[PDB]
Paper text:
In addition to the two tetramers, pentameric and hexameric oligomers were also resolved, displaying pseudo-C5 and pseudo-C6 symmetries. These higher-order oligomers resemble the pseudo-C4 structure but incorporate additional NPs, resulting in circular assemblies with diameters of ∼107 Å for the pentamer and ∼122 Å for the hexamer. The NP–NP interface areas are smaller, averaging 1240 Å² for the pentamer and 1065 Å² for the hexamer. The pseudo-C2 and pseudo-C5 oligomers appeared the most stable with uniform density according to local resolution, while the pseudo-C4 and pseudo-C6 structures displayed poorer density for 2 and 3 NPs, respectively. The CCmask is relatively low for the pseudo-C4 and pseudo-C6 structures, attributable to poorer density for 2 and 3 NPs, respectively. Assuming TiLV-RNPs adopts an anti-parallel superhelix like influenza, it is tempting to suggest that the circularised TiLV-NP pentamers and hexamers may correspond to the loop found at one extremity of the RNP or could, perhaps, correspond to a nascent RNP formed within the replication complex once the RNA product begins to bulge out.
Residue numbers in the entry:
A (entry chain A): 34 to 311, 317 to 350
B (entry chain B): 34 to 312, 316 to 350
C (entry chain G): 34 to 290, 293 to 310, 317 to 350
D (entry chain E): 34 to 290, 292 to 312, 316 to 350
E (entry chain C): 34 to 349
F (entry chain D): 34 to 350
Write the structure that this text describes.
RNA sequence: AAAAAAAA
RNA sequence: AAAAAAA
RNA sequence: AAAAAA
RNA sequence: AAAAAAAA
RNA sequence: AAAAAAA
RNA sequence: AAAAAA
């Protein structure tokens, strides 16, 4: 009785990869989601060409991609995924045609086309959620070449335009910089670099990440934070008997998705730019435990650096 | 014996919502006020299209709105409001035609048309006041996405153009920023983010917020402030016996709006940013609360009302 | 008896308001000056539309004003100013046509038209001076919502562009800000925010403000300063016998532009040798002589508010 | 008895002002020097228009000056200076023609013309020195609106380009700023902002300012400093018996116009000042050389202008 | 059994330098590598002229270079290298024609030309690795004139345009400054001033720099650092018995590339622009350490604070 | 016996000045060198004007110079230098024509002209070395008004464009400021303010400065430093027996050039902008030392913390 | 502290 | 409190 | 000291 | 930590 | 590690 | 003083 959102993704994965798609390995699920996302975005070889307003270089690249041979059944996409003959039929029948707009489909009134468009949008959202989680997981041990300063580190992950479009609440990069550094409409969403995302093996089955489920330290760290978040977050994971690279979640930080500490001048008071700093290493984070909420002092070192130092 | 301003609002609400309109619920009154504001602004489906100078996208949107089916009797507007069959008549007779200007109505000399225009203006003012109070109430627990820095929070609330037009002194957002960041005429009003707006249940009956009236903490906080104001304002409320989410107002802050203590440099004298400060612990600042006995100075807390509510939630 | 400017203003006000113009009330004089400035600036209804380079939004307003009926005889102006039946003739005769420029009139060579343009310019200057004085007077007991910081106060008063053009040195506002920001030439005049302006009842008569004149505190303060100026300027006033309402002037401020100590002979420089701001003093020139009065450190408006409480 | 410069100045002023020229009033001498500078600079009405490379706006003013009638005999100059009927003859005879250059005169070989040009140059130098002294004297009790920051005060006084040309090392202003910012050759001179300049009544006589001279406090301060200088320099004066108005000079400041920098070299660190290394500014001292000897007087930390203002209040 | 990359370089060096190319001297290998780099980039006299968009001065220089007599067999290039007569044939057959782009070669489908272009590009990469190592080795005792402040010292090595084209990750200078001070594509590589480059006598045989091989202190320091890096890196070397200017590598620094000390704000915490300096107020920079990978394991060694250039000078 | 440069310089000076040219007086050699540098740059009267891209005022100046009669035979130069009647022949022969460029001469292929141009370039280098040495010697007892702050003293000496073209590594001033500010190619040379330049009586002879040479304090200091350089360098001298005016050199400072104290960040460390000042907070510069190399060895001598001009002023009082 | 490039 | 008046 | 010279 | 709209 | 690509 | 002139 899973939601249609995850049912669509499971059906797509089964149809495109057959039995080679393991629903337990996070790398396998992430690779499958990435391939499905690039298929639904008309980015694979032999797919439609993006030549609406393409420049000379972009036009030539799109022409080469369209002319390039499309993937064939038996091709290796990743490390444990093999395409099936049904992938072509799934692409032809499920992937909406390039440039399709939901308004036109709704006006046409075709129930099948509307359902296909809705499923495509849901699949894009799920794929980009998984891809953001995988970007966090990757950055935990191998940062990007662009991240040099806090001005750069404020916009992670550096995903492509389609990734920003699908889940602009979570995605960042260049397009999030463009949006934030510009006019903001009523439907403008803020970049939640630390919004919770269950691990893909949990996501594709709809499980809600919670206390008491078996996961790895890297899994939880790439779930609730990313490479450059503070190291205190590691306290949300506890190794089990014998460790073995598998433990259990002991809590989840509060105030994860949002934050605000401004106090405007009012009734003769003075405005405060930050209630906290109004000691820096003495800051604490609230963790929700089975017993209740507790305060844990920060460590002052990034999760990336802390993991590097604790590697050995 | 209510003023015509509130009488018009009550009559319109009754006509448009039958008995489904509850006058004791703040949320229901806010929903009714918003619906009336959008109806009188020609924003509902099937109403006149705003195509005087609309751009391509705006022209298309207005045409679609005009072609869209208008609301029908029995439609659910919110959670506890149901439109009546009489609503169409009120929309046809009490809503001024699109583009109507009070100057032309007054020149015509039609008493009925002049009265209709005045009633429409008063209804717009009341609805915008209710809208501002509701925005304050919502912001108490859910801050706006666009509020990231003090620069952004200085223009709260972010309401539409009609909202600023009706009550420029209470409405912020883009239009208040445009007005302040530009030429200011004699008839220029300064945004009062802390203007005391009684809860809609009190506003629609003419009751003036004061000491000794039963309200909720969120109600008082929204009426006298919004989410990002300092938490010391919570001192203005006091729970009654048994709490029960209902208490009583024990005071109202002073200096809610307005004087200037600047001293410009002249005749060799140096400029002074503040006459009082002349002579940087910001947490030692105090607010003047007008209690039943008298004015009392209460130290500031340093945490905004939103953060204080979040921390004290549980 | 009177210079050309004051005589022209007196003639204009007498012609336009008849006997309803009181020559001893500052408020009435200010209202008459404002109305005359509006008439001479083509700001009244039924006058020529300003369309030379106006934007369509401005052209709409200009056409609306042109189509609107002109003021009728007997119309109430301000409080106690009533238009005479002959105001239209004065408007048609003494008001140069829209767009008139002194160069074109001089090229024409008509002495009468040149004198008319000179009278128009003098009337504009006098009316703008009266407007500046009235703005100072209003600011004394009415804070400007626009002025919220020292930067805002630096450009007081905020008058129309015509006011700046007539009196660039006495009018601040947006156009003074633009002139200061933009390129500066010989004709650039800095905003003299504290230039002494005699009260309207004195300005029209040609009596320069001095010591001993029987003036009210508020009008004197408006003459020498405005609301946000330091309260110590109140020392320039003294109540007359029996208090009442009108006092006497005992002195005037000595405007000045410095406690610097330049580095020399190995000595380091000093930005301000006295450095407390409250220890500052102002030189008030009285009949006996100049005396240094310690600054009150409080705004003049707030001093007036406290003394009236 | 007198050098060529002072004799030339005395002759010129006597010829131009007759007996109305007082030889013991600093203000009168300053006004006469200013008028002579204007005359020899062709700055008076009816003199040659400066059009060599003038802009049309400047050519308009030059033409207006040329057309304007020249000053008449008996005209009141300053306060107590009256032009003589023979001033026109002196202006025609002793003022070199506009554009005159020493190279051309030397090429001509006329000894009289060479002497005339030399006297003109000396008169210009003397007049500009007197003008600088008068500017210092005025700044003592009259603040300049232009000066608002130490950068502005770094170029006091603000005199004309002719003044800078006559005495580049004593005149500041726009042209001194141009020279400092611009190229600096072997001929470049720095602005000696506090150079000792004897009062005009002494300068024309040739009496070098020294200890014991009966001078007024204001005029002495102008001689050794100007308005914005520190008040400690007032120690260089002493009221005479019975106070009155004229006192005596007891000493003179030292270092009125060295460098203690030590640049980095051979792995050492640069030093901004050898003395300071080891910082309260008010602790500084100035070496006043007196008749008995040099004494270090603690700085007052206050402006000379405001010291006079407070002692006058 | 060397990779194609190093086999191409060995073949080219042999063909162009006969027996005079000694494969055990770092100076000789570096000189031959620079000569081959300037031959394959068409910079020698008598080669094609770079006149696609050349300015007047550049056009004149290229015309003069083209007109200038080309080197002749037996010419001395360096100190211990002499050209052979075959060099003309090699330059004629192996050097891709001026302006030749890999895309056109691949499109033409000619296997020989594709292999030639691949060989030329791999040779450029090897020669530029050699050139960067030589720049480090030189800069241990004779700093560049352009290096004055950390802003200037941050873009070492200052190598020409083709040097940056071949190896963006290691080569710096004007083009690295340009690339970093501009838009950063996805295929953007960060300048790794302390990337580990084996000495050329090791690079042209595939040996990987590790613990327990004999090198010279300057060799090790210019392999893993340069003149203005901190002096503590000398701890990676240990002299052998009798010194003799030949010792051994006793470690290699950790965290050579990819060091990031930021901590972004999150979950109600304040962002930190640098983990180290923040602390509480104790800004002792001389108390920091570097992690060295010894045979036993990782150890932390306190920094010395004096650049390698200055330390080598003082200990000379 | 002597390299090409010094031989050329001696030959040219002997030709121009006859026997009035003293070979052992530094001031005389410096004056003759300055005059020769003026002659070979076409800066003397009666020589070709520089009008290639000259501004109108520059064109007028050059035309006035050209119209001005050239110096006559026997004309005095400096103090004890007198021109010979053969100076015109040398000026006409050995002075390359204005605008001469080595590339054109090489294209001509004339060995005589090529050698003439090479000798001219070497003469310019020697004359500019002597010019910089004399500028230092002047700054030891006569401070410059143009130098007021360390930013101003950072560009000493202020010499004309030719003095920069001939010796970029020693000659500072406006052109060095321009070169440092502008683009820096591979040929860029940094202003070695305290390079070692043997005195003219030694430079023309070619005897490199070393320990044991009999030299006066002032000329030694102008050799290894200038007026505003720290006084500790005076330790490189010692009065000879019986005091007198000439002593001996006991050593020379080390780190004369190429001093860099930066330490870039690396391997997780924090960058430094200067090794010296960092320490722990104590910025006492008076505790710094300079390494003076002597015959016995290198000794670290504590800095005096006072300018050489000031040290010489005090020792002379 | 060798040669070849090469004016505000 | 009366008057005026959109991305 | 002298010689240049908005 | 939902429905609507929508590239260098 | 594979791909693309000068003042 | 006079002349310019959102």
């Amino acid at each position: 009785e899973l939601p249609r959102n995850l049912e669509v993704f499971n059906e797509a994965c089964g149809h495109v990869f057959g039995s080679s798609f393991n629903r337990e390995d996070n790398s396998v699920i992430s690779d499958a989601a990435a391939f499905l996302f690039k298929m639904h975005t008309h980015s694979l070889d032999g797919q439609e060409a993006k030549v609406l307003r393409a420049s000379e270089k972009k036009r030539e690249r799109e022409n080469a991609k369209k002319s390039r041979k499309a993937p064939e059944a038996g091709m290796r996409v990743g490390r444990s995924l093999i395409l099936t003959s049904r992938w072509t039929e799934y692409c032809a029948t499920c992937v909406p045609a390039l440039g399709s707009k939901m308004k036109v489909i709704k006006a046409s009134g075709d129930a099948a086309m509307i359902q296909m468009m809705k499923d495509h949008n849901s699949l894009l959202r799920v794929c980009v959620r998984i891809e953001v989680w995988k970007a966090r997981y990757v950055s935990l041990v191998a940062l990007d070449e662009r991240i040099q300063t806090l001005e750069d580190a404020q916009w992670f992950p550096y995903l492509s335009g389609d990734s920003y479009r699908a889940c602009p609440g979570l995605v960042g990069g260049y397009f999030a910089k463009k949006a934030a550094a510009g006019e903001r409409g009523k439907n403008y969403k803020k970049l939640n670099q630390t919004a919770i995302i269950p691990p893909p093996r949990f996501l594709i089955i709809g499980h809600r990440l919670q206390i008491g489920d078996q996961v790895t330290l890297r899994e939880l760290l790439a779930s609730i934070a990313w490479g450059l978040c503070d190291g205190v977050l590691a306290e949300c994971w506890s190794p089990s008997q014998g460790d073995g690279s598998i433990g259990v979640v002991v809590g989840l930080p509060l105030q994860a998705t949002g934050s605000c500490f401004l106090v405007v001048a009012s009734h003769g008071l003075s405005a405060i730019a930050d209630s906290r700093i109004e000691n820096l290493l003495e800051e604490c984070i609230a963790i929700q435990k089975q017993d209740g909420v507790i305060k844990c002092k920060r460590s002052g070192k990034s999760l990336y650096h802390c993991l590097k130092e604790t590697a050995g």
